[PDB]
Design a binder for this molecule. Sequence first.
Ligand SMILES: OC[C@@H]1O[C@@H](n2cnc3c(NCCc4ccccc4)ncnc32)[C@H](O)[C@@H]1O
Length: 278
Amino acid sequence: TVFRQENVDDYYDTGEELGSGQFAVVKKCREKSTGLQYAAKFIKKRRTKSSRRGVSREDIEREVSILKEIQHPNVITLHEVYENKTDVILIGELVAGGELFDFLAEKESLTEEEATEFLKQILNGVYYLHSLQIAHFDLKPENIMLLDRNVPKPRIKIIDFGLAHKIDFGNEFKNIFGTPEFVAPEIVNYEPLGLEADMWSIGVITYILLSGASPFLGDTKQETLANVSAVNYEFEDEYFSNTSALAKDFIRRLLVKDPKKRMTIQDSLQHPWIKPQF
Ligand SMILES: OC[C@@H]1O[C@@H](n2cnc3c(NCCc4ccccc4)ncnc32)[C@H](O)[C@@H]1O
């Protein structure tokens, strides 16, 4: 499939840089005809078929196809797609309040209620996606954006569908691999992947929200991945001594090696704590 090949600068002005991937840079922009503001993700194309730099057209088209399906308050919308010889440019919904990651850094101590307020929204967004058989496969605090950081209960949106796949056959097998601290054991072990991997990532995110510490993190990526595969984490009393047993129960039921035994998205919403590479 082909995208709009007019110069994006004919239709938009760009501003500040909002962030980046390998890979990809995201800039604020403004549509000339409406005055509305967006975020534009510039993804570098592969320059040859044999090249390992840039993103393959297959991978770009998959991301665009998935994004076109989605509309839910807790997920980003896609507005337009442009392309030229070097880039595909995905224009989508600006989320102005920064990363949950940055958030957590400033300040860094969340109550269980602040943590569950974030979590409930993440779970609602993932419920929507999983209902559509979409695995995100890159859930982490860098990919959860706040609409407005200056309100007591910030609203969030899930972003970055660069690794997202449709799961039409219960699992997919193609060596998808995100950030070591957040990937499930099946990703580490190059096993077939399904919606369960996202549920593991949610358990990791929850642990971080409550404690400010990363449960599997080692001194090298190697060591992190080995920790993940062995399910080598524990609840440090220094961080968790006054966290409720139910919060710990929730995380325990997500950080499970066997994906078949791990809580599903529907399970997570009914759980008593929630229910009202190289
Ligand atoms: O991805 C690196 C990042 O750069 C920033 N970022 C990425 N997407 C952002 C956005 N909106 C998405 C609009 C979009 C929708 C659909 C396709 C492409 C982009 N709003 C604000 N900051 C964003 C964050 O700091 C991230 O950690």
